[PDB]
Write a protein that binds this ligand. Sequence first.
Ligand SMILES: CC(C)(O)CNC(=O)C[C@H]1CN(S(=O)(=O)c2ccc(F)cc2)c2ccc(C(O)(C(F)(F)F)C(F)(F)F)cc2S1
Length: 228
Amino acid sequence: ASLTEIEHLVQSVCKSYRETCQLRLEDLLRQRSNIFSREEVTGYQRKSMWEMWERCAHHLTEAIQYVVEFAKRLSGFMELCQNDQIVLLKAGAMEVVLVRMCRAYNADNRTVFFEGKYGGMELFRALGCSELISSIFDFSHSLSALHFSEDEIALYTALVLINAHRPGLQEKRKVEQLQYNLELAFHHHLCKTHRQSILAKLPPKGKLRSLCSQHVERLQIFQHLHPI
Ligand SMILES: CC(C)(O)CNC(=O)C[C@H]1CN(S(=O)(=O)c2ccc(F)cc2)c2ccc(C(O)(C(F)(F)F)C(F)(F)F)cc2S1
């Protein structure tokens, strides 16, 4: 593949991400000043775990839909067989949602954008998953320190999704080729933007798979979601 074909793959993945990012980065950074009051926080803490799970399940479903629309816009992904398209999405959609979350996370005050405003992890107290919520805040904190650009997120999440090691793949060689092309695109873009430094600072593939397992496991006990 030529240097123009790799630059086209970068451009494309970044466009596909811009078109499916849910909220613009600009709107998220602007809304950082819009923080929940102590009474609003109290309002969430008092809700039943069932009410909180119902709400969060709806927001997670809405987030997963944007991830599905992102994968569908990656020309290579659409050429794969339905067994492989299902395997990649089921194994990677939640990992992509977890990576995308760092954009709505503010490291200054350790808050997250939730239902129109920013709030801390105490907002999620009714769920009874303090360790699971802490894990999300810690992961978003370490990813936010990198100053992850929209294009870096686009290329990195395409790689989270297009992974040939996912057990259950029929056409493994087809997935390997798509993954190899995206790695070149990712490596080339980092060189062009002088952001080679972030590669070693990114989470190991295993760290992200383990985090996601915890979240999928707790999800089972509150529905039968599209990530379940
Ligand atoms: C803002 C964008 C466009 O960049 C990205 N979109 C999002 O942030 C998607 C969120 C959707 N929600 S959420 O809004 O309810 C939420 C938001 C922040 C959190 F710290 C936790 C939940 C969700 C629900 C359960 C969960 C869980 O991980 C959680 F309950 F938090 F443990 C679960 F899967 F275990 F249930 C995750 C999310 S992530």
